[model samples]
Target: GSHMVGQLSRGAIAAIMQKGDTNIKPILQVINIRPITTGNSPPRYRLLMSDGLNTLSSFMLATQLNPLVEEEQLSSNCVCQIHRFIVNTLKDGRRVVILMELEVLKSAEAVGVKIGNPVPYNE
Candidate 1:
């Protein structure tokens, strides 16, 4: 009964993020995943994801949790449930969601295609 709190709708990631939601649970598609290098820091991942209705370019995977990526668990077109995440505001005025834990609902091979008509988030 208590698990429904903070649950996300099919196309509500943008709204929740804009409202400064502290936590969220989104079932998203992994559109893209790539390594990001900043100055001299260890490479981190930048995830391009879609929440069936809107796309989130600011989703990032914590470096310590790279096992999911390294093991080929997360990839293009993979549908997953973001079990827990924190919305953070960086010093540069950028908002990003740090994925703390996730559950694989469907693999990329099994999912085959994108689920919804998601458009890129406009700022």
Candidate 2:
């Protein structure tokens, strides 16, 4: 006779009704760091310094910052690296930024360099 999926029983409903309500809010904060080094010539965006992670290449950055790929002269064999990820806010006293530049790593090792973890659920 029990057809409810998540419900327990008639007694359970009464018991659960005594509980208080809970509130939740969905929040997203994206902090784009100030570009320590960005140029219109090459139109490169160095994320930031001191981010611990490596920097990205100028070629990769050009793709993110704009749509003109050929203008940057990016090559298939061209190596790219992650320099930094800048943020507008400061934790201590140092200003944060994102840095992307060339690296010396092998092509195979750079597989997941551009990928990131899936965003968690808030809603």
Candidate 3:
């Protein structure tokens, strides 16, 4: 089969990116903005990237069955969510420690927004 070597059109890339990523679409969709820009001023585009290592709940649970693992498993799920938060937000300057998985600030940002940081826990 002959493979096509065409560059991904802006529209095409935007469609694929929005599908795989949940964090950006709401802004694009609500504002009805196209991903590509050809305006007078060059648009500012900087993407800081990271991964989402989603583990099976069962796999996480299995660890609890072992005594040693159980000690680790006793820890809260916030650790996973913290990584998710950092990656989703482009590794913003401060590390956000989300104690409550459900309670989240409406919009987390690195600049021009409310500032937050992670502090060591006191025993």
Candidate 4:
């Protein structure tokens, strides 16, 4: 079946990402986004992504992709197709997803709302 613009990849948000999981060319939606630029650092998009089953908040969009957020393409309800990404281990034993390359497939206005009921993936 062809990929629809509004849908997210089922089960993309998993606990396994914290334990060094393989990269996924998965599609996901931006549940929330916060711009972070603390300590005179480059801007980062602190992303909360949701799949069908769960929501993950450990995803970070590097400043290199700043235009996505700056242009509101990564806003809440926008669906994104990830091309390349990396999973890293935080000092406190948590997994963090660093979004290396991504593209907006659907605009927030197009999606209009959330796709599914998703609970937080516990740390």
Q: Write the per-residue lDDT of candidate 2 for residues 4-32, one digit (tens) a residue.
A: 11111122111212231112111111112
lDDT of 1: 0.75
In model 1, which runs have C-alpha deviations exceeding 4 angstroms? 1-8, 38-41
lDDT of 2: 0.25
Candidate 1 residue-wise lDDT, 6-117, digit = tens: 2225655775577756455667888888888766886678898887778888888877768888886798888778877777888998888877788777788876666666
Which one is best on lDDT? 4
RMSD of 1: 5.2
The order by descending TM-score is: 4, 1, 2, 3
Clashes of 1: 0
Q: For every candidate structure, what is the RMSD over all alpha carbons to the true structure, in angstroms?
A: 5.2, 18.5, 21.5, 2.9
TM-score of 3: 0.14
Error of 4 at 66 (Å): 1.1
Give the best candidate by TM-score: 4
Q: Give the clashing pairs for model 3.
A: none
Q: Looking at model 3, which ten-residue stretch has the lowest summed lDDT?
A: 25-34
Q: Score candidate 4 by TM-score against the native.
A: 0.86
Lowest lDDT 10-residue stretch of candidate 2: 20-29
